[PDB]
Symmetry: C2
Subunit: 121 residues, 2 copies
């Protein structure tokens, strides 16, 4: 049962555990790199790193996928953008008016899947 | 509304975006370091970093908190323990039979709050 709980007091500046994203890509996603941690293979080309600003999160995302992840792009709540990186294959799936909380997935030599945890607004 | 969605196919090995945790602490927490990113101040002592292995996640966690986060301890599904680190005051709350997905929070010079996202089993 997916849930969340808050602990502590008021104050401070909000932060997220999801701080940066990069990918390796060609016609598909070879890897995703989350907070600098590599998930997938060594093929494709390494994208620049997107580092979230304070109070910044993914609010819209387009993922093209079939048996693998083919393309990723996203926009943040501050209008910053990442991608598209990857190819033109797969089915396009969009998340809109969300707040992405976490990106998990599965990978081998390529990025097989993503499991995106998010709040839908 | 908190949810998740999977994209892509069935291959590869699972990974998590949450890969390492350390804290800075004294009688309460100065900072939490998530995947190498420092959230909070420079006070206290720096704990060692706990890096999750393949297939490893936080299954039990005890947080002491009041106006601040006072103490963090956790156990993984593989029986590894982090902490306790911090002080002995505040109120204790425990998550048991969970899988922690993400740790967000708020911090200034100190660690004011955490928002923990998790599966409850």
């Amino acid at each position: 049962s997916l849930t969340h709980r808050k602990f502590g007091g008021s104050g401070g500046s909000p932060f997220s555990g999801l701080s940066s994203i990069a990918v390796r890509s060609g016609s598909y996603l070879d890897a995703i790199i989350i907070d600098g941690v590599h998930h997938g293979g060594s093929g494709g080309n390494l994208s620049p790193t997107f580092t979230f600003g304070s109070g910044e999160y993914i609010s819209n995302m387009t993922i093209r996928s079939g048996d693998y992840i083919d393309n990723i792009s996203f926009e943040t709540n501050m209008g910053r953008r990442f991608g598209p990186y990857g190819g033109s294959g797969g089915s396009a799936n969009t998340l809109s008016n969300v707040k992405v909380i976490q990106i998990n997935g599965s990978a081998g030599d390529y990025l097989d899947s993503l499991d995106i945890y998010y709040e839908q607004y």
